[PDB]
Specification:
2 copies of one chain form a homodimer.
Chain A: H1 32-43, H2 58-69, H3 95-101, H4 107-120, H5 143-155, H6 162-172, H7 178-181, H8 195-199, H9 214-230, H10 266-275, H11 282-293, H12 313-316, H13 329-343, H14 353-371, E1 404-405, E2 410-411, H15 421-429, H16 434-447, H17 469-475, E3 479-481, E4 493-495, E5 500-502, H18 506-513, H19 516-524, H20 530-545, H21 547-550
Antiparallel strand pairs in A: 1-2, 3-4, 4-5
Helix pairs in contact in A: 2-4, 6-9, 10-14, 11-14, 13-14, 14-20, 16-19, 16-20
Chain lengths: ~550, ~550
């Protein structure tokens, strides 16, 4: 069955720090001016065990950082240098450095910085560095064939055309063997892979030019290495330490900084009133807010709602974010509201489109809950900005596309896992525990967010009202579930009379037929457990909205 | 290698109830005078989806509360009721009205008990509080007695359980027909075991003559079966719990005196530390008393103070030969000196003095290290006499292998580190607490027979992280491989043996998942962190069996 132990991976009980280890006020107090000297003193020595290769250990740590940062696979984001644990007899050699710092320098930061310092101290000038990789708590030779193989194995790493050549040349070496590769004939016997640069015509547009402009090789290799070790770290607000560069690069998905005073509380109330007074259905605002804030990968920290890219080309064309029913009308209405509030702004208070998307989501939930008999307030922390189309990298936002969304009953053709391990994977990416997954599924089914507004999972008698009616009616035993005669995957449920009453997908009934999920649904769908469900859903929704805010603080 | 995910089982993140919800304050506020009516209304019906019985679902919920309570393995404690999916769809109309105030284990077991009580019977009592996550004349007799001794049942409760279970599914129709006409199978025949085995028959004939005694014996046997792994009598919630206590609960006398606090604690700590007792004696005694606890059936703990009693003093791990008699005599003398000469109606019990000696020894050791701390101590324990503890029942709590005391006895089903992992799982200790407790106990001096296996400290009797600093040191090479077999040794670059280790010590310096939790306490600036976390872990271990304070 489902492995629901993946949702609570790396809990706070196995963390030897507990609750007072914000890894941003410690490493910001690091002494980089002296840590580099300690690294140099450790690396430029021999040891009885593991004897030195001509002294310097620079090659060792450079190849180690490379083989630890080359695991990042774009198709799901996991890998990189900041995750897992990728020889580990080095942790018995870098220990004389970690001993002097301890909790102010995680193992990932120390290993990657050892590699970077080795590069810096072997006749080079690297780009920059940024600490903040938290430590996981489990720490035939054919030219064309080789060329296509390296192109594919770096395309999975998101290295395109010039970073591939720069990385290969630098790793094998700012020219020291480029002049070797053009000096004479080359033969073979029982390495010629580097000849792929000399053979492949796409490489020749840059590689042969690099013989005349060696400084270009150095610059592009510095940029390629900086990309290589920082690809699995996130947007540039987790980049801690006094080493980060002063410029931002287009592969980071940059967002403009705030140039306007953030909205207070009276302005929040006025905007919340102005949104739900424009004639927007709750199923529109909630769907748009979830769409903007459920394209987030908690492994590569890339995506999220910040930047407000749901109106941009990469994220509006997706079939999940159906741009035919309502994702142009909603965006036009919110843009008009933003312009109206910006023009007659009370002072220097301005609202950015990402703020309005998340605010529309929160106001829609508040209105639905107020219509459900309760009186709740959804927390909203402003500060998001809007990223222009020139800063979105249309070709990069093509893997964040959800091939299958579990909270919206979207199931695209061609899926690896049938219909509910993809929901588990999505809930793992958003870093959602099992109770939060269950409460979010229930709230989104009841509110109305299903793709194409299908009635697959809407168990509520009267929609647009945040109640636990997806949980009460799921456990009801007056209805029996059998696969539909039209075998599309639906599980139409019939009552005791013999007429069809509800209709479900594999997600709803895997909540209703598992063991742990059944226990959670029984907790959330009892009698006199509506207020608990409302509070838990508001907390889960706020966490989802603010997922990509703390690391872009 | 090791599976460190077993230590953090059932975290607080997967609990939908939050960290502010306690079962005791909720379930005591339900009225069992109406839950019984709801259960009876649900269990007397015919749901179309589930083919009902004649007219009553009872005979299916006794057999459901039995097979969910006859899986209690005494050898480790796991199983029982506190640890079909078609009944979960039938008892829902009852759990719906209650929800948070009635866990599934309590509801299913209480449905079984109510069905038994409503089938012409008068049961003993109930306590809520179970949270949720072939010719064989003698062969059958020996098989049933073995499979019921695996659940710790006597020779009278076995017959009572068999007769009752075969009756409810007094009437005594299972005994009158047992001897009616040449009753013998010539193809049930397992029931002949009572009719052939002399030990069973001796009481079975009396029951056939004294039917009224069978009702009492079966009531007590059923009460034992239901509440076998629920814990001491202080965990029984609800208004149904009986007013008497039984010898299988490991009862302790109630407090009949005031409780020492905040000045008598200081006086007793000074008197303990001024009696000429080594830190390696007080810490070892306190750990021995408070590390015989099974966090699966909640049986054991320091409460009751049985370290001086026969079941727990004879164990080889406690080592009664060298130092467990001098310590106990000294603490008993201190108790007798502080009881009679006490200022008023204030008194101290021997279990309190054992735990207080442990805390005072740790305080003295830490003060010798260079810090100045106070180990919190919550009194309340009492002393259980010898007549209130069973020699035969406690023979299974004996640790055949202790990892924190570096004790490894013959007959090891698993290597020396999986036993440590299982022991730390029983005490409900997370991985950081396991590592810190191992380091602190090695440094303080608690090893069985005072062996220098794992003592990496240059000068003992000082609570420091020197077990962590010297373990990660790479100036020492371990002559045998750290993961093959035997006891290792540490040799420096000069070829001279410096440290001596064991398979339990050299896992916190060779396991990539556990060597990460020794680089947090083994650092340069992480001495006070280690001291504070060791005090927290020691307090958690001491207060494991304090169910009357929570």
């Amino acid at each position: 069955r489902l492995n629901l132990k993946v949702l609570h991976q790396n809990p706070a009980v196995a963390d030897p720090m507990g609750a007072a280890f914000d890894y941003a006020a410690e490493v910001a107090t690091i002494d980089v001016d002296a840590l580099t000297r300690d690294i140099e003193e450790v690396m430029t020595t021999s040891q009885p065990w593991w004897p030195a290769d001509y002294g310097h250990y620079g090659p060792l740590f450079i190849r180690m950082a490379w083989h630890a940062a080359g695991t990042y696979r774009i198709h799901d984001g996991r890998g990189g240098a900041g995750g897992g644990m990728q020889l580990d007899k080095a942790r018995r050699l870098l220990w004389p450095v970690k001993k002097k710092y301890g909790k102010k320098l995680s193992w990932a930061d120390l290993i990657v910085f050892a590699g970077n310092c080795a590069l810096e101290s072997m006749g080079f000038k690297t780009f920059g560095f940024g600490f903040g990789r938290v430590d996981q708590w489990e720490p035939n030779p054919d030219p064309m064939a080789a060329a296509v193989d390296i192109r594919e194995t770096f395309r999975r790493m998101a290295m395109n055309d010039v970073e591939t050549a720069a990385l290969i040349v630098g790793g094998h070496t700012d020219n020291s063997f480029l002049e070797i590769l053009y000096g004479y004939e080359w033969e073979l016997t029982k390495l010629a892979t580097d000849l792929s640069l000399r053979v492949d015509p796409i490489y020749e547009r840059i590689t042969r030019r690099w013989l005349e402009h060696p400084e270009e090789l150095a610059d592009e290799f510095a940029k390629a290495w900086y990309k290589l070790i920082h690809r699995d770290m996130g947007p540039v607000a987790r980049y801690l330490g006094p080493l980060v560069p002063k410029q931002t690069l287009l592969w980071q998905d940059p967002v403009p900084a705030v140039s306007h005073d953030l909205v207070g509380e009276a302005e929040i109330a006025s905007l919340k009133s102005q949104i739900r007074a424009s004639g927007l259905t709750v199923s529109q605002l909630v769907s748009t807010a979830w769409a903007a804030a459920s394209s987030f990968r908690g492994s590569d920290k890339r995506g999220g709602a910040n930047g407000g890219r749901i109106r941009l080309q990469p994220q509006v064309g997706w079939e999940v974010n159906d741009p035919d029913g309502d994702l142009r009308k909603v965006i036009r209405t919110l843009e008009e509201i933003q312009e109206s509030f910006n023009s007659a702004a009370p002072g220097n208070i301005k609202v950015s489109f990402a703020d309005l998307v998340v605010l529309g989501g929160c106001a829609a939930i508040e209105k639905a809950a107020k219509a459900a008999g309760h009186n709740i307030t959804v927390p909203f922390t402003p500060g998001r900005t809007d990223a222009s189309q020139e800063q979105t990298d249309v070709e990069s936002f093509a893997v964040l596309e959800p091939k299958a969304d579990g909270f919206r009953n979207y199931l695209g053709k061609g899926n690896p896992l049938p219909a509910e391990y993809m929901l588990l994977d999505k809930a793992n990416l958003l870093t959602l525990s099992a109770p939060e997954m269950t409460v979010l599924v229930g709230g989104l089914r009841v509110l109305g967010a299903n793709y194409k507004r299908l009635p697959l999972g809407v168990f509520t008698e009267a929609s647009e009202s945040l109640t636990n009616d997806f949980f009460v009616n799921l456990l009801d035993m007056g209805i029996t579930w059998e696969p539909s005669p039209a075998d599309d995957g639906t599980y139409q449920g019939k009552d005791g009379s013999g007429k069809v009453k509800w209709t479900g997908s594999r997600v709803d009934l895997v909540f209703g037929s598992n063991s742990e999920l059944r226990a959670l649904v029984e907790v959330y769908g009892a009698d006199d457990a509506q207020p608990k469900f409302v509070q838990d859903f508001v907390a889960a929704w706020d966490k989802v909205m603010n997922l990509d805010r703390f690391d872009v603080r």
